[PDB]
Amino acid sequence: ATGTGLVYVDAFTRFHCLWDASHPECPARVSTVMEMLETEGLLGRCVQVEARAVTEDELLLVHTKEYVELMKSTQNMTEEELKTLAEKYDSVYLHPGFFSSACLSVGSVLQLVDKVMTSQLRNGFSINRPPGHHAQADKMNGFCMFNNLAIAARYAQKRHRVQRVLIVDWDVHHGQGIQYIFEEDPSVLYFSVHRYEDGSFWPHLKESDSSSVGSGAGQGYNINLPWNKVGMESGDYITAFQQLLLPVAYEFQPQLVLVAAGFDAVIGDPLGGMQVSPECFSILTHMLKGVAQGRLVLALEGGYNLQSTAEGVCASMRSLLGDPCPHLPSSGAPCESALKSISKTISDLYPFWKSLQT
Numbered sequence: 001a002t003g004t005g006l007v008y009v010d011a012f013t014r015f016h017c018l019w020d021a022s023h024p025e026c027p028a029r030v031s032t033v034m035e036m037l038e039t040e041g042l043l044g045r046c047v048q049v050e051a052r053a054v055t056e057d058e059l060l061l062v063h064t065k066e067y068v069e070l071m072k073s074t075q076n077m078t079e080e081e082l083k084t085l086a087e088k089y090d091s092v093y094l095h096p097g098f099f100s101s102a103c104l105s106v107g108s109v110l111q112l113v114d115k116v117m118t119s120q121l122r123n124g125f126s127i128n129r130p131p132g133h134h135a136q137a138d139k140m141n142g143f144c145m146f147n148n149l150a151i152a153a154r155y156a157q158k159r160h161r162v163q164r165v166l167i168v169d170w171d172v173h174h175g176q177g178i179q180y181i182f183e184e185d186p187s188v189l190y191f192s193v194h195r196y197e198d199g200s201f202w203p204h205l206k207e208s209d210s211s212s213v214g215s216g217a218g219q220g221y222n223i224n225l226p227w228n229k230v231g232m233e234s235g236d237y238i239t240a241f242q243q244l245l246l247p248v249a250y251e252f253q254p255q256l257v258l259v260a261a262g263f264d265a266v267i268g269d270p271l272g273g274m275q276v277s278p279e280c281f282s283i284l285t286h287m288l289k290g291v292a293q294g295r296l297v298l299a300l301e302g303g304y305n306l307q308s309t310a311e312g313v314c315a316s317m318r319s320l321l322g323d324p325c326p327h328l329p330s331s332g333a334p335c336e337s338a339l340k341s342i343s344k345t346i347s348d349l350y351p352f353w354k355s356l357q358t
């Protein structure tokens with residue numbers, strides 16, 4: 001009842017980029033996480049939860065039937081056919097086992113949602129690949145086939161009857177797929193902090209700026225925090241949570257929190273350009289446990305330095321398990337650029353959240 005669930009299956013290693021041996025999204029990402037969780041003694045403290053394959057009806061909560069069928073057909077394609085299809089999307093590869101692994105990747109999150117919503121566990125972490133946060137209703141994107149967390153949010157609502165879900169995306173990239181899926185939906189609050197640099201950084205979208213607040217019934221329920229300088233640190237992230245995310249989260253009163261738990265903002269990542277210590281993620285995880293009765297599920301997104309990502313997962317897991325947060329050496333104060341971004345996001349979201357008004 002007070003336990004932390006962990007989902008991992010060997011199938012998560014059974015796909016890789018056939019035409020580029022240097023591709024950063026590779027099986028070692030999850031192997032190294034599991035090895036470090038074990039050597040740190042954290043794996044044995046978790047409740048191992050079985051994965052399952054997502055069903056078609058679960059996928060259809062987010063994705064179109066035509067897209068699901070096309071993705072299913074990739075399991076029977078030749079390498080040349082896989083490459084031709086992958087080239088129709090941005091930043092994607094395909095492999096004959098990609099679809100099977102992607103189905104287990106979604107299902108791993110759903111299994112944890114079941115355990116957490118029924119109070120059989122307190123919280124949990126899926127150690128899954130492929131990632132999900134860029135996947136869209138009818139498109140692969142950014143190493144993603146199916147939108148793991150968007151499916152999990154709608155599943156929590158349909159199966160477990162949850163009214164409000166908060167999705168917190170701390171991967172260094174903007175989860176535009178999640179934003180698009182819930183753009184008009186006030187029942188799923190999406191918060192993303194991400195490198196932006198005025199669009200210079202992938203995925204180069206105007207709608208990754210803080211002016212994209214959602215639309216229609218969803219106006220105010222999409223919150224982007226774009227960083228416009230590299231080198232952000234733990235104090236920048238903690239300050240963003242203290243000034244912006246936590247006040248809104250308590251006002252929103254979510255009944256489940258899902259985290260797009262990428263670790264490409266950790267120091268040493270080859271792509272992220274940030275300098276966040278792995279230990280920061282103990283604090284950020286702790287800061288999210290005070291809403292939704294602690295019903296908190298993390299799912300792996302990006303993160304490409306094998307050691308940095310494994311250290312970030314372990315730091316998050318220590319907090320899920322209830323270990324006291326470490327002291328961080330830095331003061332917690334944000335740099336000027338981070339403060340500028342936080343203030344601008346608050347300015348854009350002020351009209352929709354009493355907890356931000358001054």
Ligand SMILES: CCN(CC)Cc1ccc2cc(COC(=O)Nc3ccc(C(=O)NO)cc3)ccc2c1
Pocket residue numbers: 091131134142143171172173202262264271301302303
């Ligand atoms: C020899 C020097 N190069 C190494 C090969 C450096 C280099 C740096 C950045 C590159 C960026 C792109 C654009 O494409 C993406 O960045 N894609 C992408 C990345 C991460 C995630 C993710 O983690 N999301 O959460 C999603 C999508 C393409 C090529 C690049 C090459």
Ligand SMILES: [K+]
Pocket residue numbers: 169170171172173174175192193194
């Ligand atoms: K993000």
Ligand SMILES: [K+]
Pocket residue numbers: 182183184185186187188189190214218221222
């Ligand atoms: K939304």
Ligand SMILES: [Zn+2]
Pocket residue numbers: 171172173262264301302303
């Ligand atoms: Zn990323």
